[PDB]
Amino acid sequence: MKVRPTVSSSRRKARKAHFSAPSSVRRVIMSAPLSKELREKYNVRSIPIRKGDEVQIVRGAHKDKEGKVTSVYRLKYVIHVERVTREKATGQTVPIGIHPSNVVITKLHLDKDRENILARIKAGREQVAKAKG
Amino acid sequence: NNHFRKHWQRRVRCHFDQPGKKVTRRLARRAKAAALAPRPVDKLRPIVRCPTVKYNRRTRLGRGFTLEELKAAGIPRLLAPTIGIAVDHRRKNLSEESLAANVQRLKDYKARLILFPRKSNKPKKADTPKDQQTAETTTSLRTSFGVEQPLAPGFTEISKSEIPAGIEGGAYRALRKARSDARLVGVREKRAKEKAEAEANKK
């Protein structure tokens, strides 16, 4: 149960904020869990997804398919994964929309910003665990 | 008797904000107490007797102590509101009982007062020393210095030997005589002038 007066349990306000969030908030919303070996490697459960990541789909009709994240289409909350596509009537190839909560990240596109993100999340997790221990 | 013949619906006041206003008042009181710590949140008030014959049986808290009360208690009038004593200059002391009660009240407050120095490195003679600066304190002068006995005691036991004889002729007859004398004070004095003038004329 929420206690803070700045927190709202209004379903209307929650849905308005979710469906009218800007791009920087949609990036945080479009997060995916890491794989197991990545979780023991980095001590990080979840990260925002981005282009160039390698994912395994764990939900839906395209389960257990793996590929590279070719697109992060934040406007309808979708990632486009390589080779997880379908054909139109004409036979042309169109990507299939996958929500990021239905995939698991198996390989990270690593740049120094991602290293700083992982390092500060790991440091925060460790200092919370030490404070509560 | 229904006074609804005006445009009454335009000034109907409800009170849905009653618990919210209680919460706001409590928050303001807590902020005032935190700002005024370690002083009490209120000022010391004198004990005064209510006007009119309906309420002159009861005492209550007044606005402030009189200048004569402060002079008799030995507190200067410029020092008094700076140490939590309310001062009223309009009220006077017409009798000794209320004056003595309020002087005793001021003396109790001054005896229980702890006065911190303005500069901690240079304490003064009228300042409370640091080894007596620590004690259990109060923060509500309305509670610690309330009206202890607002009404007179309604029951008292005396021995049968010391029962008073009372007014001769009876209390009812005494009241009737008092009313009759009050009604006839003018006519008797007028006939007193008349008898004096007659005696002076026919002496």
């Binding site: 149960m1 349990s9 209004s10 379903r11 | 109907v12 409800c14 849905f16």
Partner: protein, 260 residues
């Protein structure tokens, strides 16, 4: 809103031969022109008797009657048939009223939700907690879109003493669904008789059980009420020797033979 259905300019077209005498919106060039207004039967009109904020929302109840009802619900909570009649799973509860030692709850003993849940399972409120856990359902109606999305049953109410047991047990019991907590000096009839039905399952602490008499002695202007009936066992009263030894002979039976 007090101006709803009245933000239009409209007048009736008078008595004639074609249309009714409802006020009609003046002007032209739009669908609103000529349409009815100001009536409770009209579309886009003011309702009959619009609701006002100065309706009487709150009910003043005598404090003596509140204390009477709280005492009655407390007495009903010590009767185990009423606990089953109110839907509580108390078949494994060792004793009613259930008293737990204050050493198991005082301080930070059950400040963790796992420890509080383990204590409930140990004392036997576990089936009731599980009943509340699996009774969760989606609400039928508009309450879902007005912020009341789910319904579930009521579990145990733990009554404690804040002076002797502390207040971290509140945090320990907070996250368990249906489990409620209450100080012994602020007992709530809305919790003691949920929905007006008597027999709430209460887990007591020893400190609260000890402090209950002082709590009901400290209520100024209220005494524990005297019943109009001294012996509630009607069977014992009727079949006692004192009544039965002076009765008449029975003038018939439960079944009467048909004569003709």
């Amino acid at each position: 809103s007090e101006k709803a259905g009245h933000q239009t300019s409209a007048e009736s077209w008078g008595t004639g031969r074609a249309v009714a005498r409802i006020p009609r919106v003046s002007g032209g060039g739009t669908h609103r022109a000529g349409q009815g207004a100001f009536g409770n039967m009209c579309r886009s009109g003011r309702m009959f008797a619009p609701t006002k904020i100065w309706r009487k929302w709150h009910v003043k109840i005598n404090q003596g009657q509140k204390r009477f009802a709280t005492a009655s619900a407390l007495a009903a909570s010590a009767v185990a048939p009423l606990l089953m009649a109110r839907g509580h799973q108390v078949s494994t509860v060792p004793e009613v009223p259930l008293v737990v030692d204050s050493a198991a709850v005082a301080g930070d003993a059950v400040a963790k939700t796992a420890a509080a849940y383990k204590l409930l399972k140990a004392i036997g409120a576990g089936p009731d907690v599980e009943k509340v856990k699996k009774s969760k359902k989606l609400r039928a109606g508009k309450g879902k879109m007005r912020g009341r999305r789910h319904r579930q049953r009521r579990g145990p109410l733990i009554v404690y003493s804040p002076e002797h047991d502390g207040k971290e047990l509140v945090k320990g019991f907070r996250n368990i669904p249906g489990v409620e907590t209450c100080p012994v000096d602020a007992l709530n009839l809305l919790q003691l008789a949920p929905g007006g039905h008597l027999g709430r399952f209460i887990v007591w602490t020893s400190a609260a059980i000890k402090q209950l008499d002082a709590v009901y002695e400290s209520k100024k202007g209220f005494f524990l009420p005297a019943n109009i009936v001294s012996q509630a066992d009607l069977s014992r009263l009727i079949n006692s020797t004192e009544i039965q030894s002076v009765l008449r002979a029975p003038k018939g039976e439960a079944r009467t033979k048909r004569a003709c």
